[PDB]
Design a protein around this ligand. Structure first.
Ligand code: HEM
Ligand SMILES: *[C@@H]1O[C@H](CO)[C@@H](O[C@@H]2O[C@H](CO)[C@@H](O)[C@H](O)[C@H]2NC(C)=O)[C@H](O)[C@H]1NC(C)=O
Ligand SMILES: [C-]#N
Ligand SMILES: [Ca+2]
Ligand SMILES: [Ca+2]
Length: 336
């Protein structure tokens, strides 16, 4: 049966090399299987790699990008000069070394390191993992990565061209539940985007909907909005997407069930992992990905705030009854 040298069982012999890069990533890149900055930086990288894909550029006779091809590593010299790719160089070099040492393609390595990093974060779904993407890539065209100062129309058009519906854009944003910022306001380095930057949960959707009350740093940084409590950072595109009529009802439905959020995110990520590829030409090695520990906490409106403090923006469905916490307002420490 396909037994790999280490004695694990898998579906196909092409999956066996991935048990070795699992060990290396967990011990080294993830510093003992932790859910800290390397996982958050890999999640920006998989998005920035895969979104360099534009059918409208191809239609106009231009190169439109190869999608999830590892071009952000193979052509980092040109892609890391793009505005959205700051604070990624160290992570890209660590990944380059693993790819070269294990003989796997860069596009596959990024997808694999995303599924493995998320498995270290409580509450995460098991992401699908496909292997076989060609290692050959051309540099991504510029201006294909949505930025935090863009309007909701600009973001939905860019994501729509890549292939995502407005609903899938909200689903994909569940990754900001494991997030902080470093380059928008350097004065409050690693300020989290929700109160549990180490748990994949619904808190990001709940807390971006809360009324912006607090300025967390000495000044406001690029595309920064008032947040609901000390230490939390709120990005303008996230504030706008939570409130815009085209995305507000899907954003609201993501607040009460970690289970629904996880399924929707896993589906949207599987679609993003094969942009520029035919998934029927890839081999499924999903059984190499381990289970994350379960998250047993329930969704809550933190620190004494109530439903009266969230700015309900979906005019059709009433806000879900979420639990409240009898606390003083929290102050978040930097994400680890
Ligand atoms: C509407 C599109 C989105 C925009 C405009 C956006 C923008 C940003 C920006 C400006 C940052 C802060 C980076 C920094 O200063 O360090 C950030 C962080 C982050 N984003 Fe996004 N994002 C979006 C979608 C996504 C998606 C789809 C994913 C991946 C599936 C993602 C994953 C992350 C993660 C995990 C971080 C945290 C980085 C860290 O803590 O080091 N983002 N995003
Ligand atoms: C994937 O392609 C890249 C080239 O784009 C290869 O990367 C180079 O690998 C050699 C040795 O294998 C290194 O000395 C170079 O420094 C690498 N270049 C870059 C830009 O990183 C990589 O080896 C290829 N991988 C496979 C398995 O074919
Ligand atoms: C996010 N980039
Ligand atoms: Ca790419
Ligand atoms: Ca969270």
């Amino acid at each position: 049966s396909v037994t790999c040298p280490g004695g694990q069982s898998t579906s196909n012999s092409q999956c066996c090399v991935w048990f070795d890069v699992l060990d290396d990533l967990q011990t080294n890149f993830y510093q003992g299987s932790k859910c800290e900055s390397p996982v958050r930086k890999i999640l920006r990288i998989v998005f920035h790699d895969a979104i360099g894909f534009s059918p409208a550029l191809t239609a106009a006779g231009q190169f439109g990008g190869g999608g999830a091809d590892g071009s952000i590593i193979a052509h980092s010299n040109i892609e890391l000069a793009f505005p959205a790719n700051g604070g990624l160089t160290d992570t890209i070099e660590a990944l380059r070394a693993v790819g070269i040492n294990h003989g796997v393609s860069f596009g596959d390595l990024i997808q694999f390191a995303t599924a493995v990093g998320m498995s270290n974060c409580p509450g995460s779904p098991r992401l699908e993992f496909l292997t076989g993407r060609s290692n050959s890539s051309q540099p991504s065209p510029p201006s294909l990565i949505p930025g935090p100062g863009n309007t909701v129309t600009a973001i939905l058009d860019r994501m729509g061209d890549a292939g995502f519906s407005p609903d899938e854009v909200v689903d994909l944003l569940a990754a900001h539940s494991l997030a902080s910022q470093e380059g928008l306001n350097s004065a409050i380095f690693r300020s989290p985007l929700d109160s549990t930057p180490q748990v994949f949960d619904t808190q990001f959707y709940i807390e971006t909907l809360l009324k912006g009350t607090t300025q967390p740093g000495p000044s406001l940084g690029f595309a920064e909005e008032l947040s609901p409590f000390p230490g939390e950072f709120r990005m303008r595109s996230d504030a706008l997407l939570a409130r815009d009529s085209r995305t507000a009802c899907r954003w609201q439905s993501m607040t009460s069930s970690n289970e629904v959020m996880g399924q929707r995110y896993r589906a949207a990520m599987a679609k993003m992992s094969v942009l520029g590829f035919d998934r029927n030409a890839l081999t499924d090695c999903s059984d190499v990905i381990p289970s994350a520990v379960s998250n047993n906490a329930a969704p809550v409106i933190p620190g004494g705030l109530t439903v009266d403090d969230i700015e309900v923006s979906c005019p059709s469905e009433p806000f879900p009854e979420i639990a409240t916490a009898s606390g003083p307002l929290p102050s978040l420490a930097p994400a680890p």
